[PDB]
């Protein structure tokens, strides 16, 4: 079977070596003859003439394309080629990576990225992960937003936990008075997390408005998809420090691996068809000779394109033509203005580079630690720690997430990250009361050695050791008042009394 690989960029023969020179392409009656054609151009005339020559003269039925340009219309140019050739097409990189519209019933063009509902679900999973149920939505008049917000809603009420959607925004940049109208609801901006929907040119204006109002303060975390942020290398000056985006795996998942997986899926689909019907659908005779009654010849091909299993992984696409298990990467731009991958999503598993929420402290003065570091030792009923309900993601509202410490003597070379568990207590009640009164917060974690503290040859350990070494700023626990601790820490006003007491049987 004739396969054409369109090269636009710096890709070389190493991709060819990694793609087809490593896997077995047997079990096919006809050997897959692959030809690579390279061009820097996306101008329609040259590419359509080249593909017409490859289709009529050479009878090529497989299309593989990747590039490194932000041009998004070529993704659906590929869809037109699919409509005009009835041959499978796969989008991989660059201009063939982002989302596509006009899902055509007669076209079988597939894309390796995430489908709109897929990044919607990933974003709401991230939203649940950072368990801050207050958020807003800023969305421009770019079409396709209605279905996006529709599915966001559908899922947000599908999970019947107590969400809090502040507002949904429709932006009109075609009118200068549109921004002035927008200012009224911008006055209603109080949620620290806002979900953005726009293009890149609209994005620049959006960031300009955001940093003109002053939405770059602490706690203001922004999550945008790949379309909004464009390319990672191109960093507009409007990008605020600590800006987080979600895209596809561009670093760990290299392009040769992508094309190898794609060609393996193509071979599997061809073998499945050959087992299904045992005939080779001949391509069109000419580009001007469109096949109308032969659609059924290729539609059966499509019947195997959605469901393909490769290397024991469910790399199969979905109904709209998007891989149901995509390797998604959440990247963060820090004060250094460099993009660092801080989250991964693959094989229905979500992993955070930081178990504790990363400190996206902005470039603001003061930088007072409103989130005081708090350590506590398990002592019921002051402390009641329980496992977080996996079905609900959290526990009931009065519980607070607290961290089991990083200790494992089995393998000290690897640090076993803190473990989030839902914990409650009278002390925690005092803490939330004082946090709501003083308008500050706190992080909860567990003492390393499971002890209140003792002066081991002058050096303090336990909670007292953490406080002495400034690891724990403020202390929380049922610890009495001692003179040795008084010389190293400051004892606050006690909230309950105790002492040398004697208990006897009631009898």
């Amino acid at each position, epitope marked *: 079977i004739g396969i054409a690989v369109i090269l636009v960029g710096t890709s070389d023969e190493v991709a060819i070596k990694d793609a*087809h020179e*490593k896997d077995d392409f*047997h079990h096919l009656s006809v*050997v897959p003859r692959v030809e690579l054609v390279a061009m820097n151009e996306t101008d329609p005339k040259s590419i359509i003439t080249r593909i017409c020559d490859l289709m009529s003269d050479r009878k090529i039925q497989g299309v593989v394309f990747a590039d490194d340009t932000d041009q998004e219309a070529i993704a659906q140019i590929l869809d037109f080629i699919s409509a005009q050739t009835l041959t499978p097409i796969l989008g991989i990189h660059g201009g063939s990576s982002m989302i596509m519209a006009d899902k055509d019933e007669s076209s079988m063009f597939f894309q390796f990225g995430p489908s709109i509902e897929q990044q919607a679900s990933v974003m709401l999973n991230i939203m649940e992960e950072y368990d801050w149920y207050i958020f807003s939505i800023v969305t421009t008049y770019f079409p396709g937003y209605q279905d996006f917000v529709n599915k966001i809603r559908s899922t947000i009420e599908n999970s019947f936990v107590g969400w809090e959607l502040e507002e949904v925004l429709l932006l009109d940049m075609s009118l200068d008075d549109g921004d002035s109208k927008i200012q009224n609801q911008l006055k209603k901006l109080q949620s620290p997390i806002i979900l953005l929907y726009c293009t890149k040119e609209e994005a620049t204006y959006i960031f300009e408005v955001a940093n003109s109002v002053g939405l770059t303060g602490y706690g203001y975390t922004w999550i945008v998809p790949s379309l909004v942020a464009g390319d990672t290398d191109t960093v507009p000056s409007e990008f605020p420090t600590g800006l987080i985006s979600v895209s596809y795996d561009e670093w760990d998942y290299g392009l040769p691996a992508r094309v190898r997986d794609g060609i393996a899926i193509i071979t599997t689909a061809a073998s499945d068809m050959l087992s299904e019907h045992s005939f080779i659908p001949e391509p069109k005779s000419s580009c001007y000779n469109t096949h109308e009654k032969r659609i059924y010849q290729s539609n059966m091909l499509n019947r195997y394109l959605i469901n393909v299993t490769f290397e024991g992984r469910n790399l199969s696409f979905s109904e709209d033509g998007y891989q149901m298990h995509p390797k998604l990467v959440i990247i963060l731009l820090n004060k250094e203005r460099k993009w660092e991958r801080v989250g991964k999503w693959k094989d229905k598993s979500l992993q955070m580079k930081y178990y504790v929420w990363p400190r996206m402290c902005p470039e603001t003065e003061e930088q007072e630690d409103d989130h005081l570091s708090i350590v506590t030792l398990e002592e019921a009923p002051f402390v009641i720690v329980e496992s977080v309900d996996p079905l609900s993601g959290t526990c009931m509202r009065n519980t607070v997430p607290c961290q089991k410490r990083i200790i494992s003597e089995n393998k000290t070379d690897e640090e076993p990250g803190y473990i989030k568990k839902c914990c409650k207590g009278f002390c925690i009640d005092i803490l939330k009361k004082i946090s709501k009164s003083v308008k500050f917060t706190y992080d909860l974690y567990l003492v390393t050695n499971g002890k209140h503290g003792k002066k081991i040859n002058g050096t303090w350990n336990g909670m007292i050791g953490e406080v002495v070494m400034k690891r724990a700023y403020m202390a929380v626990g049922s610890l009495t008042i001692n003179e040795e601790r008084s010389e190293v820490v400051d004892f606050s006003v006690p909230f309950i009394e105790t002492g040398i007491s004697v208990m006897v049987s009631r009898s």
Partner: antibody
Amino acid sequence: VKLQESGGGLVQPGGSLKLSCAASTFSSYTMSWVRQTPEKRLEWVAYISNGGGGTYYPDTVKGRFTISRDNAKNTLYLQMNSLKEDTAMYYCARPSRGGSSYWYFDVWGAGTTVTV
Amino acid sequence: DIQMTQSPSSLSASLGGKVTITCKASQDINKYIAWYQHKPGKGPRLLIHYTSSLQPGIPSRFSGSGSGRDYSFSISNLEPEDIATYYCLQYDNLYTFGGGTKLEIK
């Protein structure tokens, strides 16, 4: 990379003799060989893909030849059993572009004789 | 496995003469023609790709006609230094060889 044949000979009547052609990376490049008829006719013997699979034979030596490959030494392993009436001369060849498919090849070996 | 046969496996020529070999394929190759040769101890060499495909270090006197199932390969005024035998080989199902054709000089 250059191909050099070794293990040519069919002295034992009715036996099974091992021919090979080593290469001097060749790990990702497929390999083929051609037998010479007494009428000088060039004939295919066995087929191996780049990954070692797809071990098929033409309609002349089907079901009687054993073939294998090893990329560690860049060698092929072919057993001759039914070439008694042939003073054959096989030569190895490496198709270009590697892969499991087949193309047109130019890098050719040295030539080893097989005599009874 | 797709098969192929060659004809007439014989030629009658000398230092001068246009010799034509007819390739009779079985499956529609759509230009998958290949022409090879070999020497009894000089070392074979690649001659002809698709129709009249020129190659470096290769004379262009060779000509080709026809397509698909029927091909005709012609050599005009061959030299007495490249006296060898030619072969029409294709590739549809793995490899597809045939009987081949001869070439003898009086």
